[PDB]
């Protein structure tokens, strides 16, 4: 069906430019326009601009000076570029498509790209096990520590294990690095026959770790 | 720009009850309003277009009404999977603008937390830092107290909490409490206990371990 897939999240230094690629399928960029919306803590949802079927662009007023949208109809890609970012440009950026070619009701959205504006460094996380040791139900997990910036994704057994999974929201430590835990509850009797691996991927650092969690 | 004011900012109802969201425009916009749903870690999901028109794949319990400046999104029988934030969007005047949203929380019966405590791994100790994690699993409501004690000394300022958003299936929360020591301080002590207080427990539950045995 109709899908919009965006490039990965990453860090951008202050007063530097941001580039996101929106690759679409299920429709042609020659028949529909692609919009760009962002979502920040301060201003919430904020419509930025649009590139139309014919190649024209409209930019929201406060961004006409630093926004630039382009596309490649053959490669089915829309290119978003915003110049000179400051801390308060830190937000999730979406690409979206409307129901009709001319309208603004957004029925299809990209998965979003979390952009962090900061002068810090990208750092991958260490992954430490939370080993099990209540009524035949054991709890185990993974400690994903000292990374920057957000986000980080955590699955269990390559997506096959979802029931009982709790990946907690990341918290900012005094060091300026994030840390979180992802836990799951399983039957105690399965700790002998089943392997439990947390699949951690911190795309901003291209750090990909699989941690086996055993009883100590 | 049209300012869209959504009120209230938080809604809290029980399953099966009907709920209404309000979105008011700073001037008349006719019926040019759209409604979106955003679940945890999700992108917006178009629910209603032009005040009242249905969207494919959206459950029928979602509907909308209004005209001029006062618009209402309604769910006639709230389910657990409806926990999200809800936004309105106007497109009668350029540029299109969104409201600030309303949070939908769900009530349920009291559920006591299941408590688990995890010592720091020997892998982490090789780096000079110890993390002691105390897990409070599947409880309601959100209010909970976690008290850390190391050799009967009250810990304060050296722990951080994190609470998941509400679960879409059973409406419970889960909480992690992470006590952080240096490896030096962790090796100078023996007993590590997190005490948990919750409405669903008749008396505080304490999980503890001795470094080693």
């Amino acid at each position: 069906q109709v899908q919009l897939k965006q490039s990965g999240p990453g860090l951008v230094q202050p007063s530097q430019s941001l580039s996101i690629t929106c690759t679409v399928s299920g429709f042609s960029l020659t028949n529909y326009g692609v919009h760009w919306v962002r979502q920040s803590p301060g201003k919430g949802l904020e419509w930025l601009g649009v590139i139309w079927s014919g190649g024209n662009t409209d930019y929201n007023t406060p961004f006409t000076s630093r926004l630039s949208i382009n596309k490649d109809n053959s490669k089915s890609q829309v290119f978003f570029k915003m110049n000179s970012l400051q801390s308060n440009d830190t937000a999730i950026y979406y690409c979206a498509r409307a129901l009709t070619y001319y309208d603004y009701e957004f029925a299809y959205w990209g998965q979003g790209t979390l952009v962090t504006v900061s002068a810090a460094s990208t750092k991958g996380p260490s992954v430490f096990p939370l080993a099990p040791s209540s009524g035949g139900t054991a709890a185990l997990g993974c400690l994903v520590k000292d990374y920057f910036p957000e986000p980080v994704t955590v699955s269990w057994n390559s997506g096959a294990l979802t029931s009982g999974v709790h990946t907690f929201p990341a918290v900012l430590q005094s060091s300026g690095l994030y840390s979180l835990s992802s836990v799951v509850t399983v039957p105690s009797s399965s700790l002998g026959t089943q392997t439990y691996i947390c699949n951690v991927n911190h795309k901003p650092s291209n750090t990909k770790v699989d941690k086996r969690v055993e009883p100590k | 720009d049209i300012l869209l004011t959504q009120s209230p900012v938080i809604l809290s109802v029980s399953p099966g009850e009907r709920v209404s969201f309000s979105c008011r425009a700073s001037q008349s916009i006719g019926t040019n309003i759209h409604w979106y749903q955003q679940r945890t870690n999700g992108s917006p999901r178009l629910l209603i277009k032009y005040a009242s028109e249905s969207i494919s794949g959206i459950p029928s319990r979602f509907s909308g009404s209004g005209s001029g400046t006062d618009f209402t999104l309604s769910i006639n029988s709230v389910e657990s999977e409806d926990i999200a934030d809800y936004y309105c969007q106007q497109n009668n005047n350029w540029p299109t603008t969104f409201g600030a949203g309303t949070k939908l929380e769900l009530k349920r019966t009291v559920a006591a937390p299941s408590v688990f405590i995890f010592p720091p791994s020997d892998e982490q100790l090789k780096s000079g830092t110890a993390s002691v994690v105390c897990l409070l699993n599947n409880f309601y409501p959100r209010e909970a107290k976690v008290q850390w004690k190391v050799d009967n000394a009250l810990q304060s300022g050296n722990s951080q909490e994190s609470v998941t958003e509400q679960d879409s299936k059973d409406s419970t929360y889960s909480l992690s409490s992470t006590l952080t020591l240096s490896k030096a301080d962790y090796e100078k002590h023996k007993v590590y206990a997190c005490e948990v207080t919750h409405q669903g427990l008749s008396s505080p539950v304490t999980k503890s371990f001795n470094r080693g045995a």
Partner: peptide, 11 residues
């Protein structure tokens, strides 16, 4: 309420 970049939910 403020939007949370970590959970994509309002806090």
């Amino acid at each position: 309420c403020q939007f949370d970049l970590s959970t994509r939910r309002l806090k």
